[PDB]
Structure 1
Amino acid sequence: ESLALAHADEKSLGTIQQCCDAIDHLCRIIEKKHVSLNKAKKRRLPRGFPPSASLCLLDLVKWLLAHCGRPQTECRHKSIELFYKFVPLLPGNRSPNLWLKDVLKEEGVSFLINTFEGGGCGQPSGILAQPTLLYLRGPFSLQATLCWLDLLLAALECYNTFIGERTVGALQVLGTEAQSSLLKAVAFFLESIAMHDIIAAEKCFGTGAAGNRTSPQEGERYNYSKCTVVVRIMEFTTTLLNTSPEGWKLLKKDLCNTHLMRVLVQTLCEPASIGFNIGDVQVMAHLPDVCVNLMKALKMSPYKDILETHLREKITAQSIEELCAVNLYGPDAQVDRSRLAAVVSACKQLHRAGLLHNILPSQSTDLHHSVGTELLSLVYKGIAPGDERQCLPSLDLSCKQLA
């Protein structure tokens, strides 16, 4: 609970680190003494636990599983960590898959759905209480709007962690058995909130009926949380496609695959249009890797045609030809240089996934790639003075990098 309380802190203090080390020390203490803690003795009752006479380790792992859907990030990560590390130390030696089978069997899938979508524990909340940001009430503030995004992040994290490790089948856990609200929240965020700004998050004169203002740092604070969810959506889609051979039917429940391709190809061409802020290498380094993994997941699925179709307008063999030589090597017009760099970076990312030929295929069929030849010729002749004006082009750090 202290780790959960340290959510609204800064990484420079060290509270997260020290609390994590304390939790690992405790974890080692139970891991070295589980056979004595398994028997139901009479022990002190921790805060938040229901009243009882005897405490077992099974009650602790049930508490961890119930609190696995915590909106706080580090506490939820540690909750899943303790859950997976403590399930084997039960009276049996069953894997978490078999344990969740019988626990799911005793209480149906709805127990797991309420655990994942409950937004914590106790009172019903989370995306099940508020699937969209239209369910909220009161004057809209920058503090309140991020809570929905945190709840969506928590739900995505628990679902991804419990699906990717072969713990519960995707069809069993998010099929048509009962209400899920996860696909609805994902579709609402991808279509209505993604590829937008905070002015679209505040809708347009809703029930608040107040224009108010918006601080410059409020935009960045909203954009960080906004860009955090699209990434987790990409790993969620990748995990579903890679784990479930029949997962395309469940992916059809997204109802916004066109919008998913929209955000994917917009993250390709220019990530900063969505809201991805420059300045930190850590956030932007993970983006090409998850994009390539998502591409390789979609390519081995019955979604290749729609991905390719949505991709061609964004990257076209004629657009690169018409943009690659427009007043190049000049002291001005840096926007053309930036656009060419973005296009070539998108082409590299397409080559990483193995779709470069399909997006930009050969048009000459003479054992020599059409686009690559022209790019070579452009680079080899762009360093020449050209004609007979006796002017040798100069190259700077950016021009050499783009060449």
Structure 2
Amino acid sequence: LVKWLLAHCGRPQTECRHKSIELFYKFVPLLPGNRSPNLWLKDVLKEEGVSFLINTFEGGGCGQPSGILAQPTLLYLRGPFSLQATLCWLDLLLAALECYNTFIGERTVGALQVLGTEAQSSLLKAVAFFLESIAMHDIIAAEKCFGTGAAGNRTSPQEGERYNYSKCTVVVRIMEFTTTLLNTSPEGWKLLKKDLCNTHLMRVLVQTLCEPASIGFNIGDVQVMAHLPDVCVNLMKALKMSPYKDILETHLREKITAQSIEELCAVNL
């Protein structure tokens, strides 16, 4: 049962994935071995390569060769444009991000033994592509990569709002995963410099800080607007304790200054 729960952790179903992770973390410490999840996962990663755990995280739970491991970027969907096919890839990326953030965040594995090895991984490429192409623009960004010729037309407000909600959940998950990587691994800042934190993450962070509505965060809802400042300040406090302080300071200063406040509040009648 715990093997099945582990193998079905990277499935795109949000509630089912949460339940499969909770049941795993509740059933492992009561196995006949009676040990922590870290020790059991370490003892099971030896009889078979870490590629097993990698394909478990990235590869979908429902379909084995159907995760982001078989399609790292959105440029692998041969079908035409469809919100149902964009949201499924978004949910696969979210399921991978949550699995990584839950496993590395609970000290179950090492941040460098699962993401800094020589095995095939598609997490960094996917998150970099998302931050560089989708995380900044509207649904047109996801539409310009599904057979670019003969682009679609205007979308309904619900079709736009569900896409915006999915993108705003994915960006928050990326922020939480980066905060986890920073707060847990003191030397894990190396592998996230290649494509994760160069300019795209800093740009989307300083954009979320100043104008959240430009990314798609709906204002008229308190269930997420009372959590977004928390993850924002946590990511900023994690960056201020890292060598990435300089680029954060540069982006933040070029985004907001005192003269900006002055020219904004000059006329108030």
Interval of TM-score (by shorter of Structure 1 and Structure 2): over 0.9
Match of 2:111 in 1: 170
- Cα deviation per residue 1:356-387 (whole Å; 9 max; x = unaligned)? xxxxxxxxxxxxxxxxxxxxxxxxxxxxxxxx
- Give the structure with higher Rg (CA): 1
Following superposition of structure 1 onto structure 2, how do residues 137-176 of structure 1 map, counting pairs within 5 Å? 137-176=78-117
Q: CA offset at residue 192 of structure 1?
A: 0.7
Q: Output the CA distance in 2 between the equivalents of 1:295 and 1:263.
A: 13
- Say whether the 8 Å CA contact 1:131–1:184 is kept in structure 2: yes
Question: How is 1:269-308 mapped onto 2 (pairs within 5 angstroms)?
Answer: 269-308=210-249
Shift of 1:139: 1.8
TM-score, with length taken from structure 1: 0.64
Q: Report the Cα offset of residue 121 of structure 1.
A: 4.2
Farther off after superposition, 199-208 or 283-292: 199-208
Q: Which of 208, 223, 226 pairs up with 1:267?
A: 208
Q: Is the 8 A contact 2:80 2:147 kept in 1?
A: no
In structure 1, distance between residues paired with 2:227 and 2:145 = 34
Q: Measure how far apart 1:321 and its partner are.
A: 2.0
How far the C-alpha of 1:323 sits from its partner, in A, is 2.0
How many Å apart are 1:151 and its aligned residue?
0.3
Q: How is 1:195-214 mapped onto 2 (pairs within 5 angstroms)?
A: 195-203=136-144, 206=147, 209-214=150-155
Normalised by the length of structure 2, the TM-score is 0.95
**Alignment map for 1:307-326 (pairs within 5 Å):** 307-326=248-267
- Structure 1 residue 157, shift from structure 2 partner: 0.4
Alignment check: 8 A CA contact 1:272 1:278 kept: yes
Distance 1:100 1:208, change over 3 A: farther
3-state SS of 2:218 partner: coil
- 1:129-160 Cα shifts (integer Å, max 9, x gaps): 11111100112111111000000010000000
- Residue 105 of structure 1, CA deviation: 1.1
What is the CA-CA distance between 1:205 and the residue it aligns to?
A: 7.4
Could you tell me whether the CA contact under 8 Å between 1:117 and 1:127 is conserved in 2? yes
Shift in alpha-carbon separation, 1:82–1:312, aligned structure 2, 3 A: same
**TM-aligned CA deviation for residue 70 of structure 1:** 1.2
- Matching of residues 88-167 of structure 1 within 5 Å: 88-167=29-108
Percent identity over paired residues: 100
Kept in 2, the 8 Å contact 1:205–1:211? The answer is no
Does the CA contact (< 8 Å) of 1:187 and 1:254 recur in 2? yes
**CA displacement 1:299-340 (0-9 Å, x = unmatched):** 11111111001110111122112222224xxxxxxxxxxxxx
Q: Take 1:89 and 1:326, find their aligned partners in 2: how far apart are those partners?
A: 66
Q: Could you tell me how far apart the structure 2 residues matched to 1:246 and 1:223 are?
A: 34
Aligned residues: 268
In terms of mean alpha carbon deviation, does 86-95 or 304-313 score higher? 86-95
Secondary structure at the counterpart of residue 69 of structure 1: coil
Decide whether the 8 Å contact of 1:138 with 1:208 is kept in 2.
no
Kept in 1: contact 2:58–2:69 (CA 8 A): yes
Q: 1:254 aligns with which of 174, 191, 195?
A: 195
- Name the CA shift for 1:122/1:224 in 2 (closer, same or farther; >3 Å): closer
Gaps of 5+ in 2: none
For 1:326, what is the secondary structure of its paired residue? coil
Q: CA deviation at 1:109?
A: 0.9
Contact 1:198 1:222 in 2 (8 A): yes
Q: 1:210 to 1:311 in 2, by over 3 A?
A: closer
Is contact 1:265-1:311 (8 Å) kept? yes
User: Is contact 1:190-1:256 (8 Å) kept?
Assistant: no
Greater than 6 Å deviation, 4+ residue runs: none
In the TM superposition, what are the counterparts of 1:55-74 in structure 2 within 5 Å? 60-74=1-15
Q: CA RMSD in A?
A: 1.5
Change in Cα spacing, 1:119 to 1:261, as seen in structure 2 (3 Å) is: same
TM-fit CA distance, 1:212: 4.5
Q: Any stretches of 5+ residues in structure 1 without a counterpart?
A: 1-59, 328-403
Name the CA distance, whole Å, in 1 between partners of 2:206 and 2:78: 34
**Does the Cα contact within 8 Å between 1:65 and 1:79 map onto a contact in 2?**
yes
Between the aligned partners of 2:34 and 2:146, the Cα distance in structure 1 is 57
